[PDB]
Amino acid sequence: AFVGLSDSEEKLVRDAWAPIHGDLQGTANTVFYNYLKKYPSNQDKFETLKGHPLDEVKDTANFKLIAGRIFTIFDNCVKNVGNDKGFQKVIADMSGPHVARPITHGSYNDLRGVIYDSMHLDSTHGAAWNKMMDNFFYVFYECLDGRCSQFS
């Protein structure tokens, strides 16, 4: 279920994200690369990347666009962390493009974990971050299951 964050938890999330917020595209490029490398089945899901070596596509425009758009969504979720409707809306809007797609929960969760590992958070900040991401996934998966308009 969706579980709101306190004012203090919101602050924790914003602080946890600040290093990424301040280097958003550069972090996105690295994290997205590490994700595709560690979990090689996922590159094929990206039609613009499909059929080429990872190391061939990593410094291309299409690759950086994809990495950037994932991170832009999380940056906006963080923006909206103190507004559950606003937060849900960011997710609602990005969910439609995924609904029809053959992407497993495993794949999305593997990406969440690459992000987590990259942030090297202490347990206090990690707890708050995971509250947010649990909300993120709750909303996203409700929307993938065709129960998106409950957030409207």
Going by the annotation, the residues of the binding site are 48, 69, 98, 101
> Residue 131 CB, nearest distance to Cl ion (Å)?
14
| Residue 45 interacts with, from Cl ion, ligand HEM, none (CB under 5-8 Å by kind) | ligand HEM
Phi, psi of 51 (to 5 degrees): 90, 5
Binding range to ligand HEM, per CB under 6 A, among 24-32, 106-114, 125-133, 142-150: 106-114
Give the sign of the dihedral formed by CA 6, CA 87, CA 17, CA 141: positive
Phi, psi of 55 (to 5 degrees): -70, -20
DSSP, collapsed to helix, strand or coil, labels residue 9 as helix
Residue in the structure block whose two tokens are 């301040």: 22
Is residue 42 within the footprint of ligand HEM (CB under 6 A)? yes
> Residue 150 CB, nearest distance to Cl ion (Å)?
20
Q: How far is CA 87 from CA 31, 67, 81, 138, 139, in A?
A: 22, 20, 6, 12, 9
Pattern of binders to Cl ion over 85-124, x per CB under 5 A? ------------------------------------xx--
Looking from the CA of 137 toward its CB, the CA atoms found within 13 Å total 15
133-142 per-residue burial string, b: 16 or more CB within 10 A, e: under 16? bebbbbbbeb
| Residue 141 interacts with, from Cl ion, ligand HEM, none (CB under 5-8 Å by kind) | none
Is residue 34 within the footprint of ligand HEM (CB under 6 A)? no
- Which listed residue (16, 20, 111, 132) binds ligand HEM by CB under 6 A? 111
Is residue 97 within the footprint of ligand HEM (CB under 6 A)? yes
> Residue 146 CB, nearest distance to Cl ion (Å)?
20
Is residue 39 within the footprint of Cl ion (CB under 5 A)? yes
End-to-end CA distance of the chain: 16
